[PDB]
Ligand binder design. Sequence first.
Ligand code: CA
Ligand code: CA
Ligand code: CA
Ligand code: CA
Ligand code: CL
Ligand code: ZN
Ligand code: ZN
Lengths: 166, 7
Amino acid sequence: NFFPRKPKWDKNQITYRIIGYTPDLAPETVDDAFARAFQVWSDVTPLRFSRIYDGEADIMINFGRWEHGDGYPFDGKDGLLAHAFAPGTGVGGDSHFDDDELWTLGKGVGYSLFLVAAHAFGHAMGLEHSQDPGALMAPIYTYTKNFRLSQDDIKGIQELYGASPD
Amino acid sequence: XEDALEX
Ligand SMILES: [Ca+2]
Ligand SMILES: [Ca+2]
Ligand SMILES: [Ca+2]
Ligand SMILES: [Ca+2]
Ligand SMILES: [Cl-]
Ligand SMILES: [Zn+2]
Ligand SMILES: [Zn+2]
């Protein structure tokens, strides 16, 4: 359920910056997908995720293929879809998406940028894999048309950061 | 696979 030594953010505002995009979707639809992915965690905690348009954000977001700047290379089609670093300084929290995947918001012909980002941002906030088959933090991708964060996910994220104020 | 990294 957590990384070794339970790293977490020691603040409630987490900045993020989208360094670059995929050509597979419109940029405003990518922005919206990342926003919605953060909101699944915002909604049940006091966390807020603020977009910045320059400088060093807590979560630097980018797309790449194979070796893309951190010595944990992507792998072409399928397998590694995205990866995130546990909370911390430098690369901590950074979330990368493999552009050898076809990015979509639906089923079958690619991977949901929304669902993959929500899972990866769970890692960026300090959650490890769940063994609860219904949890977003369960390790195996699926497309869900009616996505609902599980009580397992809510329990983990609240254990680190507490519950929503409202 | 290794989608959750430490550092
Ligand atoms: Ca960072
Ligand atoms: Ca590359
Ligand atoms: Ca891949
Ligand atoms: Ca792609
Ligand atoms: Cl690259
Ligand atoms: Zn990376
Ligand atoms: Zn994962």
